[PDB]
């Protein structure tokens, strides 16, 4: 349990740390190298000092709920300023200049024939 | 009661000297402040009115009175007695606190603010200010605002003339 979130017990530490929101593979490797810990050692077979060092490194990366709040604040700011990206966020359409005549399902939801 | 102290000390003297009152009892004072929100769409969704009442209560500090239709209107699909508004009356310390807050914390938060109408006087020394976004007020978080709606703030004063109401409000700090 790191950053208030449980991580798979039987998964290697490097992979299991990716389950933390805001932690991917690159940041997981970087954290693991900063807080010296075997790459292949599973979290279940881990030492309390290693866990404490990992927590110490993680706490300052600005992950999880803080990251979510920052992203939501950015999205809300661009919605509020009445930007083009904000209008597209409100309408649930692609924001990064895709074509909506086809292949916009991940933004427009399921097909409504 | 900073605003009340200001009125007792500076505004009283300034206004009395300006208007040549033979007695202090003629000095106008702010009798009350009535914050009204007319929710016509409560006809279609009472929940709108409930949220509006909650927001007004948070703004003012006291439960508002729910105002109901005085008469039935076919065009509005309005039946007599249906709650279609909320109102709060503020007097004394609560009034003064709300007034200074409205002048200092709330009003400047208006986008592209350029002052409030100087002609918005009923003609007898009472001033009505139509705010257009509840988000102006600091007590409301835009996250919880399901809809944005305006308010009417009626400052009812004992002044007999719009000139004296303007002088009193300006001394208090109303932009124009």
């Amino acid at each position: 349990r790191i950053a208030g979130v449980d991580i798979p017990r039987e998964k290697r530490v490097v992979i299991s740390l990716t389950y933390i929101y805001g932690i991917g593979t690159s940041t997981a490797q970087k954290i693991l190298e900063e807080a010296n810990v075997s790459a292949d050692t599973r979290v279940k077979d881990l030492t309390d000092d290693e866990l404490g060092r990992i927590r110490e490194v993680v706490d300052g990366y600005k992950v999880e709920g803080d990251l979510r709040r920052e992203t939501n604040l950015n999205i809300k700011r661009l919605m509020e300023i009445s930007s083009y990206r904000g209008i597209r966020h409100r309408r649930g359409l692609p924001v990064r200049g895709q074509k909506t005549k086809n292949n916009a399902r991940t933004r427009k939801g399921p097909v409504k024939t | 009661n900073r605003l009340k102290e200001k009125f007792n000390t500076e505004v009283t003297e300034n206004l009395m000297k300006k208007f040549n009152y033979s007695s202090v009892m003629e000095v106008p004072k702010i009798d009350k402040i009535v914050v009204n929100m007319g929710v016509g769409d409560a006809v279609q969704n009472s929940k709108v009115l409930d949220n509006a009442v909650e927001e007004l209560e948070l703004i003012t500090g006291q439960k508002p009175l729910v105002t109901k239709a005085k008469k039935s209107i076919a065009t509005f699909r309005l039946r007599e007695g249906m709650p279609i508004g909320a109102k709060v009356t503020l007097r004394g310390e609560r009034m003064y606190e709300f007034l200074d807050k409205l002048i200092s914390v709330s009003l400047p938060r208006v986008r592209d603010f350029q002052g409030v109408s100087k002609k918005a006087f009923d003609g007898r020394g009472n001033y009505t200010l139509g705010v257009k976004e509840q988000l102006i007020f600091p007590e409301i978080d835009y996250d919880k605002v399901s809809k944005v709606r305006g308010m009417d703030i009626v400052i009812v004063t004992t002044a007999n003339t719009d000139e004296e109401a303007r002088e009193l409000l300006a001394n208090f700090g109303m932009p124009f």
Binding site: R77, I81, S83, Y84, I87 | R111, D112
Partner: protein, 80 residues
Amino acid sequence: ARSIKKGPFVDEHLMKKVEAQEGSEKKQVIKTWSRRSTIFPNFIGHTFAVYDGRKHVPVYVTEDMVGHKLGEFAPTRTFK
């Protein structure tokens, strides 16, 4: 342009028109076709009538609008 090594782009005519009458507090609306001009802090509090293709949409500049283009606030297509 976009690259940091180059300064944020803005039309010289637009920038000089904004700078003109800076001291006076009776700032007026500035007609502009430059949808591509970036919004500098100098633009805060100004009104730009930005051409969107057929008409000049008025745009009021605030602090949160700094760093974006003037075209991002004058939509070009109409839907529903």
